[PDB]
Each structure stands twice: as C-alpha cells, then as structure tokens.
Amino acid sequence: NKDMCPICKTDRYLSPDVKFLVNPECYHRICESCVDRIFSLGPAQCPYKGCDKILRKNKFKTQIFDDVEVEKEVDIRKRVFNVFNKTIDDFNGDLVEYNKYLEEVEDIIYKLDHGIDVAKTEEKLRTYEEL
Template structure:
C-alpha cells in the first residue's frame, strides 16, 4: 500500500510543486508544462513523462518506492490542490455510484439512516485503507447483485421472462460463482433469478433492512391512434363482389383491370360515402357548440 502523495515539509515550498519528480524539469523553463496524476497511486508527474513511460503499454510507477502498474489512459489532470482530497472525492464518487438508494426506497427514515451509516463505513474503510480487500469485495458483490436485480426488473416487461438477457445471464452466473466461492453451494441465499420483484436481493453480508418491495408498474396498453373509436364499419359489411350487372361489366372492362385497380377499394369508398352520416346527430353537436360558447 502506498501512501498518497502528501504535502509534507519537503514540498511545503510551493515552487516544489512546479518541478516534475521524475524528470526534474521545472515549469520555470517550460510554462506549458502540465502535471498529471493516476488514481491508482496519485503520484504526480509531467505530461511528457507520462507520454515517454506509458505510451507503449502499462508500466510501473517511476516514483521511488511505488510499484503500482499504471496505464496511460487513466492519467488525468488534478482537480484539487490537496491530493488527499482528490483521492477521497474519487472514492466517494465510486461508492456513491454503487450505493445509489434514496430515502424513498426505504420504509422508514431509521432504515435509511442505517443504510447511510453502512455506506459511510465502507467509504471510510477505503479512504483510511482498512480491510481494503474485504471492502472491495463487498462493493463488487453488492454491485453485481444490484445489476442482477435491475435486470430482473427490466425483464418483467419482456414477453418471455424465462429467457433472461445476455447481460443478466452473465451477472447471474457471476453471482452464482461468488456464492460458490463463499462455500455456500446449498443456495440458502436468495437467488436473484428466483423471485422477480423482490427488492431485497443482495449478497449475504450486505442486506439492508426496510427496503421497499419493488412493485412493477402496470403493463402499458397497446397504442390506439383512434382513442377507442372503431374504424371498422358499424352499419354494413363490405363483400368481395356484388352481383350487379353494370358493376360486372365494369370489372370485366380491361380499362379497369389494366391499371391494377382493386374494385374492393371502390366498394368500401362507396359504402363509406353512403353510411358515414349514420350515428352522427347534428342537433347534439349543435348543443355542445352552443354550451361551449356561453
């Protein structure tokens, strides 16, 4: 475990912050010099050092005593003057992304406060480097369980819930593997796949009480562009052909057949024209209009 770069007595002088600890070049000589840090160990170095050392792939941190393997993509500019603050903010952001429950997710305020306390404990363990491995494991397990739970919630809308999505299958497999790794092959822990809609599925060790049960919203009705209005004719049925002499003549006329004209279109238009006034009461319509005006 390496300590984050602290501003000890050796670099109390603000000028020291302007010198790259790797190549010793100073901002005094190159005013465009940019310092970068890597959240892996928070050691600061100049951009050209990062380019030189990490361009060909991951490499160990060049700061003496730090053996962390760093990647170029992870380097970024420092946001806070104090690197301790920088690190704490990063950790808090990472933990908050996993533990994203709100007060509304809990039955009582007390349960929510208990949850917040657990989250704060995890955060402080990571910040102060206490039980880092166990805490990281807890974090990963909880994240996997949350993902599996969300996938199940998403599946409640799918026509066939017995077929989980590829991602869900991967997550479920992972959680199953984690349970096996914990020596619990009997499956005493709730299987995320067993009960859709249960909001309390988390890995053992990180179960929060007082979580509200997940209630899936009612399924949406299929979209009806006519808002319940029946487009099908109510007063007549269109036949495929009619035994009328002039109509038969017209059908057999090559002029009509030639254009690919479908006589059934003609039938439905003609009948629609004849019957479309049915069921519309002009007097009723007038009353509504008058009522609107006054």
C-alpha cells in the same frame, strides 16, 4: 516540488507550457512529457522511488483538488456511489433506515480510504454491485 516535475524537474518558470497529471492508482504527480515517453508503447511500472504499482497512460487525469488525500476520498466516493446509490424514497420515507443506510455507506468509504478491511470490504462491494 512546488512547480517542478518530480522526475524531470521541468520547472514552469523555464517551461510554462508544462502540464501536470495524476494517476488514480498511486496518486503521483507527473508532467505530460514524462507520461508519453514511459507509457506510449505499453504499460510500465511507476518511475518513483518506492512505488512499484503498474499503471496505464489512459488512466491519467487532471487533479481537481489541490490536496491529494481529499482527491482519494472523492474518487473512492464516486466509485462507491456508482454501486451504493439510493434515495429517501427508496425506503418509503423511513428516515431512521435511511440514516442508518447513509452511515453504513460512510463507514464503508472510511474503511476504503484507510484500508481497515480491504479484502473483506472489496468483496462486499463486488457482491452488492451484481444485485
């Protein structure tokens, strides 16, 4: 797992040109070679033991942080900050309101990361983004 593809086990030592990729849907490492073959002609199920989440090739990206757990939080933070975005001037300098607003956003992000209330919170995200 150190430097070999979980599927084809193409180690970098024998294939230094190998390049790894990850998918936000399940955050699973996979080399470029496997991605093209399984998803070139259309969507397919993740080829992992225990994972049945479908994914598309276009969604693959390069991992930034070496820790998968931190990657999930940052991407969720980016998704939330695309809807829940405000500044101190938004509350006319009211620090107390701004601090409470920041904590609420942090609370939402925490719930999304650990799936406390996925159904209820997801609806709240959809409700707010419209207005």
